[PDB]
Design a protein around this motif. Structure first.
Motif, short mmCIF file in Angstrom:
data_model
loop_
_atom_site.label_atom_id
_atom_site.label_comp_id
_atom_site.label_asym_id
_atom_site.label_seq_id
_atom_site.Cartn_x
_atom_site.Cartn_y
_atom_site.Cartn_z
N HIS A 111 0.83 -1.20 0.00
CA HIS A 111 0.00 0.00 0.00
C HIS A 111 0.87 1.25 0.00
O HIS A 111 2.05 1.22 0.34
CB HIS A 111 -0.93 0.02 1.22
CG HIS A 111 -2.14 -0.83 1.07
ND1 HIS A 111 -3.42 -0.37 1.34
CD2 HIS A 111 -2.29 -2.12 0.69
CE1 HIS A 111 -4.29 -1.34 1.13
NE2 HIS A 111 -3.63 -2.42 0.73
N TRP A 112 0.26 2.36 -0.39
CA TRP A 112 0.87 3.68 -0.29
C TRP A 112 -0.09 4.60 0.45
O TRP A 112 -1.27 4.67 0.11
CB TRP A 112 1.23 4.25 -1.66
CG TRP A 112 2.53 3.71 -2.19
CD1 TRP A 112 2.70 2.66 -3.04
CD2 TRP A 112 3.84 4.19 -1.87
NE1 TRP A 112 4.03 2.46 -3.28
CE2 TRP A 112 4.76 3.39 -2.58
CE3 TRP A 112 4.33 5.22 -1.07
CZ2 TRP A 112 6.13 3.59 -2.51
CZ3 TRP A 112 5.69 5.42 -1.00
CH2 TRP A 112 6.58 4.61 -1.71
N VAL A 113 0.43 5.29 1.46
CA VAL A 113 -0.39 6.05 2.41
C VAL A 113 0.37 7.30 2.81
O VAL A 113 1.58 7.24 3.07
CB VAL A 113 -0.74 5.20 3.64
CG1 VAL A 113 -1.62 5.98 4.59
CG2 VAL A 113 -1.45 3.93 3.20
N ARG A 114 -0.32 8.43 2.87
CA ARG A 114 0.29 9.70 3.22
C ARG A 114 -0.50 10.38 4.33
O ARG A 114 -1.72 10.19 4.45
CB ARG A 114 0.37 10.63 2.01
CG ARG A 114 -0.98 10.99 1.42
CD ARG A 114 -0.83 11.57 0.02
NE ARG A 114 -1.90 12.51 -0.29
CZ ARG A 114 -2.31 12.79 -1.52
NH1 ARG A 114 -1.77 12.21 -2.58
NH2 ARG A 114 -3.30 13.66 -1.69
N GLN A 115 0.20 11.16 5.15
CA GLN A 115 -0.43 11.99 6.17
C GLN A 115 0.02 13.43 5.93
O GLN A 115 1.21 13.74 6.04
CB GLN A 115 -0.07 11.52 7.58
CG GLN A 115 0.06 12.63 8.61
CD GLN A 115 -0.22 12.15 10.02
OE1 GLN A 115 -0.74 11.06 10.22
NE2 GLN A 115 0.13 12.97 11.00
N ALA A 116 -0.93 14.29 5.58
CA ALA A 116 -0.63 15.70 5.40
C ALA A 116 -0.32 16.35 6.75
O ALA A 116 -0.79 15.88 7.79
CB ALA A 116 -1.80 16.41 4.73
N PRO A 117 0.48 17.41 6.75
CA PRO A 117 0.75 18.11 8.02
C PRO A 117 -0.53 18.67 8.62
O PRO A 117 -1.33 19.32 7.94
CB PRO A 117 1.71 19.23 7.60
CG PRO A 117 2.31 18.76 6.32
CD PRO A 117 1.23 17.99 5.63
N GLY A 118 -0.72 18.40 9.91
CA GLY A 118 -1.93 18.83 10.58
C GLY A 118 -3.19 18.12 10.14
O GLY A 118 -4.28 18.65 10.33
N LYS A 119 -3.06 16.94 9.55
CA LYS A 119 -4.21 16.18 9.06
C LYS A 119 -4.03 14.72 9.46
O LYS A 119 -3.12 14.37 10.22
CB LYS A 119 -4.37 16.36 7.55
CG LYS A 119 -5.18 17.57 7.15
CD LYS A 119 -5.89 17.35 5.82
CE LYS A 119 -6.12 18.66 5.09
NZ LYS A 119 -7.42 19.28 5.45
N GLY A 120 -4.91 13.86 8.94
CA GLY A 120 -4.89 12.46 9.24
C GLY A 120 -4.36 11.62 8.10
O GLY A 120 -3.74 12.12 7.15
#
Lengths: 124, 152, 110, 152, 124, 110
Positions: free
Chosen positions: E35-44
């Motif tokens: 999988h590929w998964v990202r977390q934006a700054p100040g987000k989920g």
């Protein structure tokens, strides 16, 4: 005496409709699917219509679609074949018969007993 | 010396059905008006203990599951009996690789064995099916399942 | 012009063997089951072969049928004058959602 | 006094399979790259005679069906073994009414039991499966089947 | 030491593409779906992409469709996440993780081990 | 704006109990399985609940989850300062053909 008789034959003016009543005796109507089959003079068999055990499903043929209608009355144990606008090609001995098979992709047909047939002779 | 009677059933027991000259029924009210395979001279076998008897020779008022009577669905005036199973009932054409699949082949719902009884000497063995993939009948059919829990 | 094609006619001496071919696509004879029907003149047609390999009770053992691929064949052993009629195939067309019968073959003896 | 060993199998025998902590595999090369459920500490049971043994504790070079060795599909360098069944293998979540359906749920083709063997003390049980209808695992799974004919 | 490491971060000019290499060590690559998964700054968290065990099927997200491409190279045991035309919203710590779950209608996800993540910092 | 909705935050005293709700339609949480994730700051998120009722090895027994209809709920026993992180849902949406994660809930202690 298990029988499945058909009534409603005779000479008919072209372009008129008949109800081919099919009285069933000697067996449970709701456990069988009744077929309708005709043989034109000098020709072979041709399957016409089909109804389910409870009348939920009504199946037609390509050459009879639009001009034909199947109906079931399980209270009277009689299946109804409503012909419409008879042509020169349907002047055939309409046999009727009962089937206990299926219809889904691997369908197996068991058209066990065929009636003596009613003779539609649409002409002048 | 006698083993457990076939009238006694416990959850997890393996049932072995034989349905000689089995035919096809468009709808069975015991299975909610769904297609089924039924035979007149069917035979039921319990694999774990080896007990077997013809379905028509079983007095279904006496059969018990885990010490409890089977759930009876009196549908259209015909009294049926329920032998539940864990999982789907696996049935196939007798003696060949010709194999059948039940109606609820896509779901996780388990299957059951239904028998119609007249109270005399006529019982009909009903197994859940989707279509005539083994034929419209009379066709020999052999089945297998594992008994489930009591109805709740 | 039917989907299931049959020879127009066939003949043999009394007591001999005849076979009637019957073809079709996978949607009817490859997937579904087939059946054969005998139409003695003057009476209603009968069921002699069902499930592509089995006969109803009362049909003589001399009749047989077998499916090879998307095609089925009727087999009649011991031809007789009485067993002179019209034979038809019968199967369901899943693609067409209709019952398709055989074109028609006429048994004769000479 | 000893009964028939579990290494001996005959057509029509009922096999009882338990897969503790079974997980889900996207594709099994023994089943033609199709999803399957596999467990490490599985147990296999023969219902007819009651014999049972851990799958990792039985040597597949000796197992026989009807007096013949099992068909081995050496797929990707891994030696598997085939225990054929008459009909589909019926499996369900252990202790639950929730049931599993194999990959060939719509088809007529019967199912088989596949086992990977290292030749030592590690054997993996593989059962035909369509998806994660019982979970991605580790989840307890119990199954049942009836042995079929020798490969031709 | 089972690891699934990600490389290819750094400050990136807007509107440019990168290849987020994902080296896999300590486990069999062909038995898992990455999988590929990202977390934006100040987000989920936000799921991005998915590849099969053999790379036959490639799955995207609604917000990443068109701008993203998944690829698998089982010979090198490395899955490739081709980002295209990075926006102001994807400047996130791209985690990458392995999954042994399914996708069919009763799907169960087991995204077992997640990498430390690579930081895409698209800005000036 | 995620399909699986979650409370923005929740808090309790140390050693107490909290629960985080998580809703959705049948296409994702009614048909498919859901899972939970803990994201401790400065490290990678972890798997604590899978299969809606089970935990991976090493996850403490104080964590629990259960699905009630088309909705799942996280269950935490014995709140601690260390167990303060962001918790997310995770499931497959068959209709959307994509993996949908939870919106996000932030545990705090006060």
């Amino acid at each position: 005496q298990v029988q499945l008789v058909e009534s409603g034959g005779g000479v008919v003016q072209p372009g008129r409709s008949l109800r081919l009543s099919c009285a069933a005796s000697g067996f449970t109507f709701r456990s069988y699917a009744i077929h309708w089959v005709r043989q034109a003079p000098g020709k072979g068999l041709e399957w016409v219509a089909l109804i389910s055990y409870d009348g939920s499903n009504g199946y037609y043929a390509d050459s009879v679609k639009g001009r034909f209608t199947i109906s079931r009355d399980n209270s009277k144990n009689t299946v109804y074949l409503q012909v419409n606008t008879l042509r020169a090609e349907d002047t055939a001995l309409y046999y009727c018969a009962r089937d206990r098979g299926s219809i889904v992709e691997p369908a197996a047909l068991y058209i066990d007993y065929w009636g003596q047939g009613t003779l539609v002779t649409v002409s002048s | 010396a006698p083993a457990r009677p076939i009238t006694n059933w416990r959850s997890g027991d393996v049932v072995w059905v034989t349905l000689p000259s089995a035919e096809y029924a468009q709808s069975q009210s015991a299975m909610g008006s769904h297609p089924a395979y039924w035979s007149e001279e069917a035979t039921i076998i319990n694999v774990a203990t080896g007990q077997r008897a013809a379905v028509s020779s079983i007095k279904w008022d006496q059969v018990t599951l885990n010490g409890k009577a089977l759930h009876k669905e009196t549908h259209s005036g015909l009294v049926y009996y329920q032998l539940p199973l864990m999982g789907k009932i696996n049935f196939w054409q007798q003696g060949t690789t010709k194999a059948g699949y039940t109606y609820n082949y896509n779901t996780t719902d388990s299957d059951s064995l239904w028998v119609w009884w007249d109270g005399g000497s006529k019982a009909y063995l009903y197994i859940s099916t989707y279509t005539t993939m083994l034929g419209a009948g009379p066709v020999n059919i052999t089945g297998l399942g594992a008994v489930g829990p009591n109805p709740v | 012009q039917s989907v299931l094609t049959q020879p127009p006619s066939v003949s043999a001496a009394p007591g001999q063997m005849v076979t009637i071919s019957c073809s079709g696509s996978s949607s009817n004879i490859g997937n579904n089951y087939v059946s054969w029907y005998q139409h003695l003149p003057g009476t209603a047609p009968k069921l002699l072969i069902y499930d592509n390999n089995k006969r109803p009770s009362g049909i003589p053992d001399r009749f047989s049928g077998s499916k090879s691929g998307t095609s089925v064949t009727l087999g009649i052993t011991g031809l007789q004058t009485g067993d002179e009629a019209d034979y038809y195939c019968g199967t369901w067309d899943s693609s067409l959602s209709a019952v398709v019968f055989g074109g028609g073959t006429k048994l004769t003896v000479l």
